[PDB]
Amino acid sequence: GAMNSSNYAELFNNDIKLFVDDTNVYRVTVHKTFEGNVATKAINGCIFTLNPKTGHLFLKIIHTSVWAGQKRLSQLAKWKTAEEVSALVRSLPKEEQPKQIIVTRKAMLDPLEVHMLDFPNIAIRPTELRLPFSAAMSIDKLSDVVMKATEPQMVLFNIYDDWLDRISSYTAFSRLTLLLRALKTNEESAKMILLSDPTITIKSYHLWPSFTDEQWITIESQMRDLILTEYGRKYNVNISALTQTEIKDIILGQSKNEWRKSAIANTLLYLRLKNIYVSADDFVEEQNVYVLPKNLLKKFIEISDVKIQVAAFIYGMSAKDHPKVKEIKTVVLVPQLGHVGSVQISNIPDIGDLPDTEGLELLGWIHTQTEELKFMAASEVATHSKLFADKKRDCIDISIFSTPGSVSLSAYNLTDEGYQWGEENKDIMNVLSEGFEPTFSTHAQLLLSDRITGNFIIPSGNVWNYTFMGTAFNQEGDYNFKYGIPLEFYNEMHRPV
């Protein structure tokens, strides 16, 4: 079973996998020796070994000393790669050793297999993707250490920089392959994109410029721009006639202790409440005004996670002479399978059987996130459309962004463009947002208030976080509910036995 954009999803599950690229192993330069005579001398190379989940790059620098008088070097390069890749795997603890080792080029299959025979439960996979890992030398920081290299040496790198603090692995790898593919297409223009307004620089310990979550999107857009542009020259067919999958395919080449650590991290989320910022755009008196109880914010934060998104539904009502003042009365925590940058949410809850629900109107949904945007993220838009396209479109999106020291609330409505675009993308996941617009959503007037106080509705089963219980999570489920205090993200009732 080869790998293509079909099983592209599996790359990021909890099974260690390594990519191997050997395009950059055997390299030479047309260099003039003393006399002035021209001839190709061999220069340092490297093995592009990449764990796509954690972003760990095991770049093995291949010094030119190894090509010492060897015959037929290009043939040997494939066996010296297999040798070193094998050597690597064997040095990792049995827990860190991968399930699959995906090679970028067919010619690298056999050599690796031969050296990995005593490792049968470690598969050696080919790829029907012609990934842009060949352009790993574009990265000056890498290209440098390889040339700088004076002797054979194993150099470690993180290729996602610090992205994984904000976005998922899935989305991280996307951004990566997009960058590398751009460089592979037109290196100068690709770099020009990354290296304009020098106000945004690249840190020492980083390979990439320090863009904001908002800046990153424009960058990626400019990358797709640059890539599709020059695919509409090699085949010069009209680019604006591609279906999403085609665009996606063009870019690809078609410890119980770890648990208790992030749990502790969440016990500190409540501290971020001592500095609260509420997104204030310009508002018209024709707009509704949503007042959010501060206790409902305080608690929602406390039960949320530092990375993984936590979402819930919001209910409320109005008062005499002003239906435009929407009071949030209840937050409904529902069975959900959260991720990083997205959240799988179950259907709108059946709270009719509960008391005091009489008269409550569904205001929309509230959720947390790791990114920092002035607009609904592609994921949000997608989730919002699946939720309220048919039901109730005047629903709002209360987006909570949290970071050490402060929280940041924002309310959004979704234009008919957004709802419509959210349908034709039931589930896309990021860095391929061809059709996405920041103006898909507009600001909704939100106010926090310790002048009113709301309550919670929880699943009658008490559990709501199925992130670690994915198998026992029915999204179409017909769940029953009840009032009660919601539990923490890493509550011992949320962990797999």
Residues 30 and 178 placed together within one structural domain of the fold: no
Query: Nearest 5°: phi and psi at 76?
Result: -70, -35
3-class DSSP state of 314: strand
Please, are residues 221 and 381 in contact by the beta-carbon 8 Å criterion? no
Residues 79 and 225 placed together within one structural domain of the fold: no
Residues 111 and 90 placed together within one structural domain of the fold: yes
* Deposited resolution, Å: 3.3
- Give the H/E segment covering residue 111: helix 109-115
Number of domains forming the structure of the chain: 3
Residues 45 and 153 placed together within one structural domain of the fold: yes
Residues 411 and 453 placed together within one structural domain of the fold: yes
Please, are residues 365 and 345 in contact by the beta-carbon 8 Å criterion? yes
- List the Cα angle 342/347/349 in 5-degree steps: 120
Residues 212 and 152 placed together within one structural domain of the fold: no
> Residue 396: which domain range?
255-497
Distance separating alpha carbons of residues 428 and 339, to the nearest angstrom: 14
Distance separating alpha carbons of residues 163 and 175, to the nearest angstrom: 10
Residues 288 and 402 placed together within one structural domain of the fold: yes
Chosen domain end from 158, 193, 224: 158
Q: Look up residue 348 and give its DSSP letter.
A: P
In Å, how far are 175, 279, 447 from 404, measured between CA atoms? 25, 18, 22
Q: How many C-beta atoms surround the C-beta of residue 354 within 10 A?
A: 18
Distance separating alpha carbons of residues 248 and 432, to the nearest angstrom: 7
Query: Nearest 5°: phi and psi at 227?
Result: -75, -50
3-class DSSP state of 73: helix
What residue has token string 């009071």? 327
Please, are residues 28 and 41 in contact by the beta-carbon 8 Å criterion? yes
Contacts of 258 (CB under 8 A, 6+ apart): none
Q: How many C-beta atoms surround the C-beta of residue 443 within 10 A?
A: 18
Q: How many C-beta atoms surround the C-beta of residue 367 within 10 A?
A: 24
Contacts of 395 (CB under 8 A, 6+ apart): 362, 363, 364, 365, 384, 387, 388
Technique that determined the structure: X-ray
Residues 128 and 187 placed together within one structural domain of the fold: no
Q: How many C-beta atoms surround the C-beta of residue 371 within 10 A?
A: 21
Q: Cα dihedral angle (49, 121, 472, 312), rounded to 10 degrees?
A: 0
What residue has token string 């530092």? 306
Chosen domain end from 206, 226, 254: 254
Distance separating alpha carbons of residues 179 and 79, to the nearest angstrom: 29
Distance separating alpha carbons of residues 360 and 145, to the nearest angstrom: 63
Chosen domain end from 158, 185, 200: 158
Please, are residues 411 and 397 in contact by the beta-carbon 8 Å criterion? yes
Q: Secondary structure of the chain: what % helix, strand, coil (to 5)?
A: 35, 25, 40
Contacts of 161 (CB under 8 A, 6+ apart): 203, 206, 207, 208
3-class DSSP state of 225: helix
Residues 120 and 131 placed together within one structural domain of the fold: yes
Distance separating alpha carbons of residues 317 and 323, to the nearest angstrom: 8
Distance separating alpha carbons of residues 419 and 384, to the nearest angstrom: 8
Query: Nearest 5°: phi and psi at 202?
Result: -110, 130
Residues 279 and 178 placed together within one structural domain of the fold: no
Please, are residues 493 and 462 in contact by the beta-carbon 8 Å criterion? yes
CATH number for the domain including 82?
3.30.420.230
Distance separating alpha carbons of residues 378 and 375, to the nearest angstrom: 9
* Cα 169 to the center of its chain, rounded Å: 5
CATH number for the domain including 246?
1.20.80.40
